[PDB]
Design a protein around this ligand. Structure first.
Ligand SMILES: [Cl-]
Ligand SMILES: [Cl-]
Ligand SMILES: [Cl-]
Ligand SMILES: [Cl-]
Ligand SMILES: [K+]
Ligand SMILES: [Mg+2]
Ligand SMILES: [Mg+2]
Ligand SMILES: [Mg+2]
Ligand SMILES: [Mg+2]
Ligand SMILES: [Mg+2]
Ligand SMILES: [Mg+2]
Ligand SMILES: [Mg+2]
Ligand SMILES: [Mg+2]
Ligand SMILES: [Mg+2]
Ligand SMILES: [Mg+2]
Ligand SMILES: [Mg+2]
Ligand SMILES: [Mg+2]
Ligand SMILES: [Mg+2]
Ligand SMILES: [Mg+2]
Ligand SMILES: [Mg+2]
Ligand SMILES: [Mg+2]
Ligand SMILES: [Mg+2]
Ligand SMILES: [Mg+2]
Ligand code: NA
Ligand code: NA
Ligand code: NA
Ligand code: NA
Ligand code: NA
Ligand code: NA
Ligand code: NA
Ligand code: NA
Ligand code: NA
Ligand code: NA
Lengths: 194, 92, 56, 237
RNA sequence: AGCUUUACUGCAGGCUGUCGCUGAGGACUCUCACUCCGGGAGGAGGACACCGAUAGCCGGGC
RNA sequence: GACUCGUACGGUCACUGAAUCCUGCCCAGUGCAGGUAUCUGAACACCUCGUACAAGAGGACGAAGGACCUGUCAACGGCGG
RNA sequence: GAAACAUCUCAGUAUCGGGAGGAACAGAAAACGCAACGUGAUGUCGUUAGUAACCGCGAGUGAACGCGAUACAGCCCAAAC
């Protein structure tokens, strides 16, 4: 039979319809008044969180992060530039908003490590993403056969090196075949052309 | 100069002389789907667009003859070299 | 007044001093910032790639 | 070229800032829960460095001591009132509604409780004209008819220091002293006296603006100089 | 190289339409988002404005 | 964020440059501003054609702007054969 | 550099911001597409090849599959119950 979770999931397929719609029209009012990074006791999208690795356990944290919508907040050139490089308005950053959100969260929690994140909507001028972080030092996690992997040293600051899920996707590593010539094994080793 | 709307001449298709009708080549309309069309959209961005930033050349004092010669029996046409002509008017 | 020798006489102000962190006489006592190691501005030590040839 | 003077202003550097630390008080109407019972006595009359006009020190019944935008005619000893029931005399502050039409007012609020915005300079005054349950029409010193919430508080009488503008500064030195008490760069060098690099009117072998002086409203900063969006110029016709 | 302009090409900026935020009953009402005033109660404004995106015009300010 | 502890007797942007006698004529061009029946005027949405979809072609509507009209020279300037 | 120059080129170079490790990164196919009755995680080396592809179709720019090698290794959740 359908899991209760499946209902949360099916509701979020259309965040602009039904009860969820009214819920959002309400929450965002409180959200717009919260800060850049707010730790929250329970995930707003349980199915999504558990699906991404979440666990109601010690050392597992969640926080909602809001980032501004739109293109790069760029300064116009102050020295000579050929027309090609004189742009300001249409330039966009190569890192997606969801990735900016993951980084802002990880910095708020220096000891923790980003496990994953997901979207929880947006209003006219900002987007909110809930990030799942893990305490690599808590024994409740060091002894978890499903998460202890994040405890290894080479997982330190994993979000800042794009090892996150949204990171790897944003790095064009999704495809294993055609189209990933300049992306795998890394953007940098491919001369930064991806 | 003046020029007969119809007159006998060789038809490269029939391979024999027949009455042809002369018409000025009306410009076909573009589809905006040719390769060059896609490159314009693709390659145009911030700043100068290279070739796509250029504009229409100009005009020669007199243009050459742009005509279609239609065979009166098989209905097919053929083109010929043109010759500079300030004006061209058909007779009948 | 000449911008040269005659303007050299008023120079009795102390600015750059021995730095508590790097030992170089670059700690600007008015700004409280070392121009050499970044002490007072950065927790990380001041360093730039342009301090040496690009391929070295 | 280089940024023009109007652009250096925005940066808010010392030269362009007002000597705030030398200012006395941010003149604003008091806040009264209600009742109107609030009243106080004029204790002294001081000079206001930010407005070149006199201001009055007042002690209120609840111990509060604060400087107030002084209208003409207020002296030490006088008792002023602030509230809905305040008496209708010079110096008292009450909402435009409780004020009788045809009476000169000053330090008028734009939005009720904002503390006063309009008519606060030397000798000026607003003119309450029309009442209503919705709109109180006031005629500001510029001559404009301003529709206002009748709940907007105001002070009776014209502002003190009237006629300050009648006397010429006569000499640069006097201007200098006044200018020094404001957020202004002075003296003023004419654009036409500068180099092309410094101003859109600079350059030439003789002094004259390059193009016409009336500039579009859409002109970007760095170029919006001269007669900004002038609907007309000169005095003729 | 500095400077100029109705030189060429662009880039900021301003104005303007449109989409999103954004809701109820070619002109109109409302309140619930959003904005502002108020210490608060509450008041003004209100699906506009702001902001994000895009389109046209102006654009030696660069 | 400066102006601003400011509010038109303000402060911003320019020109001229104490006093005294004065400051004529010109709005065609250029600039600015206001208006505008009609004309012109992009994109989205909308209609037609096209494509089992799409590209694409056309139409309807039409903002600012422009045409057109008006105001303005202590606005750029002009004041001859 | 293009014998000027705007796209292009120099070059994702110089330089800047953030961060890991002794190595990093990648990695067990929503792959490949010598089209197959075929290959079988990933890096790297040799080659494929200055080939395909891009480009005021100018100057220039420039892969991949496959193959020969090196080394080989395959697994864990979410959900159903
Ligand atoms: Cl991390
Ligand atoms: Cl012809
Ligand atoms: Cl003054
Ligand atoms: Cl194969
Ligand atoms: K170049
Ligand atoms: Mg372009
Ligand atoms: Mg010198
Ligand atoms: Mg004040
Ligand atoms: Mg004066
Ligand atoms: Mg000063
Ligand atoms: Mg002057
Ligand atoms: Mg000079
Ligand atoms: Mg200039
Ligand atoms: Mg002069
Ligand atoms: Mg002059
Ligand atoms: Mg030069
Ligand atoms: Mg506020
Ligand atoms: Mg230039
Ligand atoms: Mg060259
Ligand atoms: Mg590598
Ligand atoms: Mg060439
Ligand atoms: Mg290249
Ligand atoms: Mg391949
Ligand atoms: Na962290
Ligand atoms: Na790429
Ligand atoms: Na492309
Ligand atoms: Na000049
Ligand atoms: Na020079
Ligand atoms: Na004129
Ligand atoms: Na005119
Ligand atoms: Na050359
Ligand atoms: Na050259
Ligand atoms: Na090119």
């Amino acid at each position: 039979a359908r899991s209760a979770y499946s209902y949360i999931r099916d509701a979020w397929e259309n965040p602009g319809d039904g009860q969820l719609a009214e819920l959002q029209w309400q929450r965002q009012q409180e959200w717009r008044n919260e800060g850049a990074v707010e730790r929250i006791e329970r995930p707003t999208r349980l199915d999504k969180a558990r699906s991404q690795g979440y666990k109601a356990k010690q050392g597992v944290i969640v926080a909602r992060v809001s980032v501004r919508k739109g293109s790069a907040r760029k300064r116009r050139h102050k020295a000579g530039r050929r027309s090609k490089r004189q742009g300001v308005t249409r330039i966009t950053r190569r890192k997606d908003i969801q990735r900016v959100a993951e980084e802002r969260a990880s910095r708020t929690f220096p000891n923790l490590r980003v496990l994953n994140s997901y979207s929880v909507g947006q209003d006219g001028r900002q987007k909110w993403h809930e990030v799942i972080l893990i305490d690599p030092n808590h024994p409740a996690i060091q002894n978890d056969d499903d998460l202890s992997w994040i405890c290894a040293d080479d997982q330190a600051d994993r979000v800042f090196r794009g090892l996150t899920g949204a990171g790897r996707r944003n790095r064009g590593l999704s495809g294993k075949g055609k189209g990933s010539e300049k992306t795998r094994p890394s953007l940098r080793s491919n001369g930064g052309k991806g | 100069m003046q020029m007969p709307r119809r007159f006998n001449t060789y038809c490269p298709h029939c391979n024999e002389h027949q009455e042809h009708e002369v018409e000025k080549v009306r410009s076909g309309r573009q589809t905006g789907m040719k390769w060059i069309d896609r490159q314009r959209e693709r390659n145009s961005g911030i700043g100068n667009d290279g070739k796509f930033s250029k504009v229409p050349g100009g005009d020669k004092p007199t243009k050459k003859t742009d005509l279609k010669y239609r065979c009166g029996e098989c209905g097919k046409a053929h083109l010929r070299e043109g010759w500079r002509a300030g004006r061209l008017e058909f007779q009948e | 007044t000449g911008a040269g020798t005659p303007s050299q006489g008023k120079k009795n102000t102390t600015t750059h001093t021995k730095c508590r962190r790097c030992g170089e006489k670059s700690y600007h006592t008015k700004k409280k910032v070392c121009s050499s190691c970044g002490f007072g501005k950065s927790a990380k030590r001041r360093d730039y790639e342009w301090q040496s040839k690009a391929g070295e | 070229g280089r940024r023009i003077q109007g652009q250096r202003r925005g940066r808010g550097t010392s030269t362009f800032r007002a000597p705030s630390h030398r200012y006395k008080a941010d003149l604003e109407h008091r806040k009264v829960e209600d009742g109107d019972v609030i009243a106080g006595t004029v204790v002294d009359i001081e000079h206001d460095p930010a407005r070149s006009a006199p201001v009055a020190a007042v002690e209120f019944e609840d111990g509060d001591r604060r400087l107030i935008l002084a209208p003409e005619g207020v002296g030490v000893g006088d008792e002023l009132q602030v509230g809905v029931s305040a008496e209708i005399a010079p110096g008292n502050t009450l909402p435009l509604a409780e004020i009788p039409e045809g009476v000169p007012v000053c330090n008028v609020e734009s939005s009720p409780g904002d503390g006063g915005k309009f008519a606060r300079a030397s000798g000026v005054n607003a003119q309450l004209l029309t009442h209503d349950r919705n709109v109180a029409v006031v005629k500001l010193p510029s001559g404009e008819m301003k529709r206002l919430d009748p709940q907007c508080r105001a002070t009776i009488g014209v502002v003190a220091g009237g006629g300050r503008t009648d006397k010429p500064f006569v000499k640069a030195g006097n201007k200098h002293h006044k200018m020094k008490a404001r957020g202004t760069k002075w003296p003023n060098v004419r654009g036409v006296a500068m180099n092309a690099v410094d101003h859109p009117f600079g350059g030439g072998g003789r002094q004259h603006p390059g193009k016409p002086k009336s500039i579009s409203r859409n002109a970007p900063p760095g170029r919006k100089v001269g007669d900004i969006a002038s609907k007309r110029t000169g005095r003729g016709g």
